[PDB]
Structure formats: structure tokens, C-alpha cells
Point group: D2
């Protein structure tokens, strides 16, 4: 037998950073969870009990904190590129570094109509994420995403015209609830290295903002024929607004809200045009995925 | 042996309701999770296999949906009072109904600067809750709360002057991070019944809003001597602004953010005035509780 | 305003302990999560920013570890009594200590039919818990429990003869699945102090074992008329086997498994005597509670 | 723009099945969670609002239940192969079916030393899983796994001889705790279709049993030089015992248990040979991965 693939490192590394403006007194906070897994000439740690090739996972943890102290942590695409580049440059025998970052929201509070200099709120579990793969000889591959963006529209969603056979019970509908948890990922052109990533830094926050704005406006304004049709419109608009992304991927659950027939009780009418009270269903759920690229 | 206490019912009942304005086209949504547990002359279901005294939990579930169809679901204090009153009035042998409601956020989206008529976002897992105990012969006891309001301030928190003995290692500090998940509960005066609850309906949303505003402004503006001192100021202000509440309770974790000494690495300075990068700690956590009433 | 109630301390303190027999080489492990909250003359920490009365929560954490080093951690009733007694004896102004302990399973592995000296498996998330309230001048109040014991029987559960009215849709049944997560708590006679707790130490593990054995045998062998009827039989047997407990409480969800009518598909028969495939329901769920004492 | 990849279906489908022996009275239960995602000529559902190509996710759900009624649900490799084959044979335009199954434990209870005919316990959240990819023209690709197998050994784990530089603080150790959650996956040779899967049916349960037995015996008996070294020994033994698997993959967290220095308190000795009480760490955690194949 032989090792065909291997990677190891430190997961679930929580990191906070503060920036303090001492002339204005304004503070800004950043919080993330980081994972770094390394690849390289490490097979003998597995086959021969040779730990000399292991950069200890504790040391990887230390390196995350040191890198955050000495470098910007925003945008996360940049921080992950800096961090992954470090491992392949510092260690001759390490040839790839896989950096995953989850960014947590800390939104400045408004108090009596004025932004507060040092107080923040977690407005939602929506995350901004990156996956940064730094591969020696191959450059830096970045996937950026937003996840956990939970939305609902109460009308202007439809689902009719689907295949019907002996397995089908679902009724067609011209007016339903649509609710989902948005997971949207944009895949950047390969970067040759850290210099090229730095050259595009303003594009990372701009493109996250565009993706979020397109997602919300299209969800709200599309009189949706299906999750499939609406998600494609989102993806195509994001591609049209950033030439440096190659693909946009969505993964969307269809979090079902079922009508409740109450007509067995005093003739109460709660279906169709009379539908007011619904039963949100925890499981099962539809799951719809698409990756859109340029022709 | 004998039954000393018993209650039973249906938990984890998810409920959605929509309101549609057909003149303006504006829709508004409400979503909750409901639990109803009943008490009364039910002991023989336990001791003698006598199911005649059991209102089936499935029937309790049906009743929740019917009640939501026929009545307002907001404010939740009102809905829970309506629902609990129903069981003690409908069933002679049922003498108490315990109704817990968790309200989930669906905040109207703003699209290009204008509120959208039918699209919503889950801005945060913060909940608005009620516990409504309807007890025949004793009235209606309501506890209202906000929970899951997660906040952080980056300075203007201190903790010094605590007891020091042979168990103490913690250093005093004049500048630390303070972060918590706010659980705040206000206990209303006993209401004699549903009519009295209805008479105070505008006070429920007003008091929730006051509690939230006081919590956030006091957290943001208090140069905090301890979690204890800051939470008391919140509670006293809420009591001063609503005569119909008797007590305010807070339960606050102290979600610790630890400094990280990096001076073992190239003399890097990351403590005290130089502290920039911190390690958020998942566990353990301080837990601080207070119930404040009027003198 | 004034403080009506207050308690504070450290929650979510994870603790492991090992015992090593150096003559036999046999090691035994214990793992728990501990919470300690203190009460006493602490109100001025809230009202006057007086931290002198605060035993820091960090110091409470240290004390948990020190107590585990110097004392047995099993049975948990004993450890919690030792720990809570410490705070009210050490600190004049602390008058109650509330200790909650969750014990995690580490069951010795059997390897080729022989118990292994130092390897363990988490067989299940079932917990053994205690709540120990040490109150100066009032003694020690102990509640012991098992929780997270998840069971299912595929027949010999019935539910018929319940109340039927205009809210009722549930069909009677003479053969259903019954599945639950057992939460069972036994409340000990008040103990005067730590000496009396020590005098009864063998009874704690014995009574936990009896409660577990009675729960499982009664669940398995009762042709159940309802959750209510079966849980009462468990409670009465536990009371009959330990004179030093005053009450037994059960809290049992009814985790529903719904029949699936497939007769719309090729006449397939999957209900009643033909029921083979079921849909487990995540929510809602029945919730049935009882506290049983002696007459 | 154009669709580059797409799949859709139903996730989180809970399924129970019972087998009843009416001659012996012995019942046996099976419970799973299923996901089915389909691929094929579905792009126009995304780009042109053409729902004619969509097999509704509700219909996929129905099909899961029907398939479980008409076919064995064990071993899960077989059930998933049957289910995925159905979609590519039934629907001309569907060309792949991706079936994921999580099997939940229901272990028969022993009551007074005898196996009970119809009562079961969830002994642990350990899962047995399959991923079955049925691809028209390409056969059936099966990955089998066990996950959530949580273990701890209290000695006979070491970690020394790792790389040391200016990022390293970790001390070498010759005696530590090792605890992990085992995720082990075995990748079968490609099968040409359902007939070939059926021909190997006894091998699926046999190989799961071998993987579990090898994992536990090797964990318990290896005086471990690292997680890396121990996991490789497991993988090589599993490959040696089943010629029809091509690779074995492990993913193992190193769930750290930290020593607690108490010597600041009365000189208490709790490190090194005196280490008795430890602090389990929830995060961060090492994460070690390997894929082993044959040379
Ligand atoms: C995944 C883990 C448990 C390491 N985590 O990131 C936890 C966490 C992150 C952020 N906030 O606010 C709370 C907890
Ligand atoms: C407690 C349970 C599982 C019943 N629940 O309420 C779930 C739930 C409620 C609201 N949202 O948005 C998601 C899930
Ligand atoms: C409640 C917290 C998060 C502190 N906890 O006890 C976690 C925990 C305990 C035991 N095991 O095996 C895993 C995690
Ligand atoms: C993933 C979901 C929520 C669908 N699930 O499988 C839940 C579940 C499965 C098995 N048991 O025992 C409890 C819950
Ligand atoms: O938008 C939708 N897309 C689908 O594929 C689907 N199937 C059932 N319900 C559905 N909804
Ligand atoms: O605000 C605080 N209150 C306390 O009781 C405490 N103890 C440690 N750290 C603390 N912080
Ligand atoms: O055992 C049971 N007890 C009940 O109260 C109940 N109601 C519905 N289903 C039920 N099952
Ligand atoms: O077994 C181990 N493998 C590692 O790579 C590691 N690094 C720190 N601690 C470790 N343990
Ligand atoms: Na390198
Ligand atoms: Na009544
Ligand atoms: Na005292
Ligand atoms: Na096909």
C-alpha cells in the first residue's frame, strides 16, 4: 500500500482583530474562523512514523495569529492568500496550503441616529467565506462566497409545468411562498501569486457587494418560475458585472411552507386565495444547484 | 405512589401567517414556534390507563393553527393569551394552559431604497418570546423576552477590584472586550383574564421596543465596571419606563476574548495597549444573572 | 429599584480525570461538563459597581479543577456536594452554590473478547447528570437524572380512547411505533450536609443503575396504553426500590413515526397490518411530563 | 452565459422500515436519512423557465419511499444502487443519480439477558453511510463509510520528533491522551451496474464490520507515534482484507486534552507523571487526512 493523498493542519481557529483610529477614536472589528491544511512531502509521517516532516498543527495555529497581527485581515481573499503563500515559501517540502476562512458579522451600532465608535451587533448568521488554495508552481485559486443569507417572499413565486407520471402527487401552483438559505460562490481567474492577488484587492469587497445586491434584488423582483430559473438570473448578472470571475455557483434549499386545509373544522377556508396560515416544514427539503460560466 | 404534578401537550409547532393588503399590495409575514402544555384532572391517564381525559396532542396542534387563522398572531402576548384561554374555557377538566412562543424575524427588504411589498430577510437569530400561563381562577401570567441578541464592544469595559485569594489567577483590567448574547425578560403584572390583556395591547410592542433600545444604548454607552453593573442599569431604566411590569431579569454570558502573547515570536507586541489580535473562547464562559424589581 | 434575585459563576467547564492502577495497569477515565453559580451578599456588585464581593468566575473555574484533583469525581452527586460545600464554607458572604454536572460516557473497549486497560468508546450521547444546590442553613438538595436515552419499540404501543371533539382528527390505533428520548430525574431527601451525602454514597450509582434498568425493562415489556401510563409504571417501581428518593419525574417526547399511504401508486399497501415504511417526523412532537411521589 | 454543471433533488428524507417475522415474532428495524440529486438534460429549466424537464423533488421523495417498500433497504450500498438505477432507467433524459444515505443505529435491547423481539436503543450517534453515484454509460461508483465513532485512549499515544522553528511552542510528549471522531471511507471498484452490485452483496456488511474492528483494535493496541502513523496502519489492514476496495480514506480530528498546571495553588502537582485532571478543548483541533491505495 501507499499514500495516494494526504493533508493535515489546524481547523476551527477562531480569530478576532481590532483596528483603532486614535485621531477619531473610531474602532473597527473583524472576526473569523480559519482552517489551514498543508500538503507536500509528508508521506513518511504516515508510513514510517517520521515526524520530522510535520509542521505541528499547533505551530500552524501560532502562524495564523502571527499573520493576522502583521497583515491586513480584510479582504479575506487577501488574508488567505498571504497565509497560504507563507507556508509554501517558508517550508521547502510543503507544496500546497489550503486556507478556508469564515467571516462573522459585526455591524456597527447606530445609537440615537449616529454610528457608535466601538459597539457592534451580530446582525445575522450570514457569513462571507473564502477558500484559498495556494499551490506551488500553479498559483492561487480563490473561491469567494456568501452563505446563510435566509430570505422569504410571500408571493410572486410559481411552480407549474413540471413532469407528471405515476410517481407524481404534487399540485401545480401559480402563487406559493419561496424561502431559501442562499449559498453563492464565485470562482476567480487563477492568480499567478500574491502580487496579482494584491493588484485586484478592491475588486474583492466590490464583487461580494455586487453578488449580495444582485441576489437580493433578483429574489425580490423576479416573478419566479422555479428556483432553477431565478438562480440562473442571479448568476448571469454577477458574471456580467465582474470580468475576473469565471463561474458563479448557487446551492439553494427549497424550504417548504405547506398549506393547511382547515375545512374539516367549521368549513374554515385556508387554501388557495384564502391561504393565511401555513406549516413550515423542517425536512425534507428540495435542494437545487447550478454552476454558471461564460459561453 | 401518586401523581404530584403533570402536564402534557404539543411542542415545536412551527406556524407562519401572512397578511395581504389588497388595496396597497403590501404583504406582511409572521413566523413562530409554539408549545402548549395542559394541566388539569388528568392523573388517571397516568395511573389507570384512562385516556378519556386526554385532549390528544395532535388536537392541541390543530387548535394552534385554527387559533392563528381566526385571531391576530401579534403581539405574541395577545396570541398566547387567546390560545391558553381557549383550552381552559373549552375543556371543563383542564385548569391551566402553558403557552410558549418563539417569534422569528422576517424584516422587510429595502430594494433600491424603497421597502419591498412582499420580500423579507432573516436579519439575525435574535428572537422575541413569550411565556403565557393561563391558570383557571388565577388569571394570566405573562413573561416577555428578547433573546439571542449578540453584541460586542471593543473598549469601554473594565473588570478590576474583585476578590483575590489563593484560588485567583485573573489579572485586573481597565480595558477589555465585552461580548454577550442578551436574554432579557420582563414580567407583567398579573392580568385577570383575556379582557385585561386586550386592554393593554399597545404596551406589548412598545415595551419590547423600549427594552431593546435601552439594552443597546446602555451596552454601547456605559463604561462598564462589570457585567453585573451594566445589566442592572438596563433593568432599572426599563422598569422606570413601564409601570405595568413588575420585574426585569437578565441572563448574560461573558463570552471571553483572550489576549494572545506573541512576544516569544520576534518580540511581537500584542498585549495591553498593543493588543490587536485576540482568541475568542468558545468555553468556558461566565454567566451572570439578575432579577430587578421595585423597592 | 432593587435586586430581587442574583446568581453568577462559570458555565461550560469541561473536565477530564484519569485513574491509573499501577499494579494492574488498568486506567479508568471520567469526563464531565460543570456549571457553578453562586448566591449571597453580592447585590452591591450590581447596584454600586462594588466588585469586592465578586469571587471572579475565572477563580470559580480554577476551583473546579482543584477540587477534581483533590477529591473523587464519582459519583457526581458526591463531587457536586464537595464542590458546592467548598464555596459556602470558604466565603463568609456566599450563602448558596448551585452545581450542575453533565457526565459523558467513556465505556471501556472490549478487544478480542477482553476488556482493554486504557481505551474507551463514547457509546451514545446518553448523559448522567446531577443538580446539587448547597444552601447555607438549609443543607444539600440533590436531583439526579439520566437524559438522552433514545429508544424505539416497533409494536406493543397503543393509543385509543382519547377525547374526540370538533378539533380532533387523529385516528385511534391498537399498534403503533413508540420512540422517545428519556429524561428521568430522581429527587433525594434533603441531606443535612456533606457528611450525610458521604454516608449514602453507594446508593447513588445503585439508584442510577436501577432507574436505567427499570426504564428499559418497562419500556420493552409494557404493552403501552399511552406514554402517560408507561412512564408512571417506571416511576412507581423506582420509588419502591429506593426509600431515600422522594419523587421521580419523567419528561418524554413522543417522536412520531407516520404511516405513509402509497395506495395512489399501483395500489401499494403500506398502512395498517401492511405498514412497513414510515416517515419519521422531526417536529412537532408530543411532550409528556409527570412527577410521581409517595402517598 | 451557460450552465456548466447542475443537479437538483430532495435532501433530508427520513425513512424507517420494519421487518416482522410472524413465525418467531421477532421484529427488526432500519432507519436512514436519504438525499437524491439528479443530473441530465435539465439546463433549460435554468435558462428558459422550462419545467418540463424537471422530475419534481416531491416526486423524488415519493420514489424513495416506494423503493424502500418494494426492495431491501440493507445493505445501504444495495438500496442506494437500486434507487439510483431507477432514475436513470425510468427517465430517458436523466443521466446520473447521486444517492447519499446515512444509516442510524437501532440496536436490539437485551432484557434480563435475552434479546428482546421488538425494542431497540440508539447506542451512539455513530453512522454507517454510503455515497452511490449511478452514471449512465459509466456504472455505479460506491463509497462506504463509518462516521461519528468517538474514542479515547488515556495513554499509549506519543508525539515527538516534529519540526521545530521560530513558529513552534509545542512541547514534545511521550505520553498523551488521544481522542478522535473516526470518519473512515472505503472506495469500491467501479461496478458495471446493479447486477454486479447484487453479486457482491455479502461483502458490504462484512467489509463495514472489518473496517470497524480494524479501527478499534488498531486504535486500542497501537502505541501511537502520531495520528498519521496510526491511521495508515488501519487503512493498510482494511485494504489487505478486501480485494474489491481500491482506496481507504480517514479523516481524524485530534480533539486535544490539555494538561492543567496547578502548581501555583499550594504546590499541587498535576503535570507529567502526576497529570490526573485535564481540560478538554472544544476548538481549535488538529485535522489529519490520508487516502491509502495499493502500490
Ligand atoms: C466552529 C467554531 C465552533 C470554532 N466557531 O467558529 C464558533 C463560533 C464562531 C463565532 N461565533 O460568534 C460563535 C462561535
Ligand atoms: C425548534 C424547531 C426545530 C421546531 N424550529 O422552530 C425550527 C425552525 C424555526 C424557524 N426557522 O427559520 C428554522 C427552523
Ligand atoms: C457544552 C460544551 C460545548 C462545553 N461541551 O460540554 C462540549 C463537549 C463535551 C463533551 N464532548 O465529548 C464534546 C463536547
Ligand atoms: C438531517 C435530519 C434533520 C433530517 N435528520 O436526519 C434527523 C434525524 C435523523 C435521525 N434521528 O434519530 C433524529 C433526527
Ligand atoms: O422551484 C422548484 N424547483 C423544483 O425542482 C421543485 N420540485 C418540486 N418543487 C420545486 N420547486
Ligand atoms: O464582568 C465580569 N463579572 C464577573 O463576575 C467576572 N468574573 C470574571 N470576569 C468577570 N467579569
Ligand atoms: O401516548 C400518547 N399520549 C398522548 O397524550 C397523545 N396525544 C396524541 N398522541 C398521544 N400519545
Ligand atoms: O498526532 C499528531 N499529529 C500532528 O500532526 C500534530 N501536530 C500537533 N499535534 C499533533 N499530533
Ligand atoms: Na515549498
Ligand atoms: Na376548565
Ligand atoms: Na458562607
Ligand atoms: Na436515462
Amino acid at each position: 500500500s501507499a499514500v495516494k493523498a494526504a493533508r493535515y493542519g489546524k481547523d476551527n481557529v477562531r480569530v478576532y482583530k481590532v483596528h483603532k483610529d486614535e485621531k477619531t477614536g473610531v474602532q473597527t472589528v473583524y472576526e473569523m474562523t480559519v482552517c489551514v491544511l498543508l500538503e507536500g512531502e509528508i508521506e513518511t509521517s504516515y508510513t514510517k512514523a517520521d515526524n520530522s516532516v510535520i509542521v505541528a498543527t499547533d505551530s500552524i495555529k501560532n502562524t495564523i495569529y502571527i499573520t493576522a497581527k502583521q497583515n491586513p485581515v480584510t479582504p479575506p481573499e487577501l488574508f488567505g492568500s498571504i497565509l497560504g503563500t507563507h507556508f509554501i515559501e517558508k517550508y521547502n517540502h510543503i507544496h500546497a496550503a489550503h486556507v478556508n476562512i469564515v467571516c462573522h458579522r459585526w455591524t456597527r451600532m447606530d445609537i440615537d441616529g449616529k454610528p457608535h465608535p466601538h459597539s457592534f451587533i451580530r446582525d445575522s448568521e450570514e457569513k462571507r467565506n473564502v477558500q484559498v488554495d495556494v499551490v506551488e508552481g500553479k498559483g492561487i485559486d480563490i473561491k469567494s462566497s456568501l452563505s446563510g443569507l435566509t430570505v422569504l417572499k410571500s408571493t410572486n413565486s410559481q411552480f407549474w409545468g413540471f413532469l407528471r407520471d405515476e410517481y407524481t402527487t404534487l399540485k401545480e401552483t401559480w402563487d406559493r411562498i419561496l424561502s431559501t438559505d442562499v449559498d453563492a460562490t464565485w470562482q476567480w481567474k487563477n492568480f499567478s501569486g500574491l502580487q496579482e492577488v494584491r493588484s485586484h484587492v478592491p475588486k474583492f469587497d466590490a464583487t461580494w457587494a455586487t453578488a449580495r445586491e444582485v441576489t437580493l434584488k433578483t429574489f425580490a423582483e423576479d416573478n419566479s418560475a422555479s428556483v432553477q430559473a431565478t438562480m440562473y438570473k442571479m448568476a448571469e448578472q454577477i458574471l456580467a458585472r465582474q470580468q475576473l470571475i469565471e463561474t458563479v455557483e448557487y446551492s439553494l434549499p427549497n424550504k417548504h411552507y405547506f398549506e393547511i386545509d382547515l375545512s374539516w373544522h367549521k368549513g374554515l377556508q385556508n387554501t388557495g386565495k384564502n391561504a393565511e396560515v401555513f406549516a413550515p416544514q423542517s425536512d425534507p427539503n428540495g435542494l437545487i444547484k447550478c454552476t454558471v460560466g461564460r459561453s
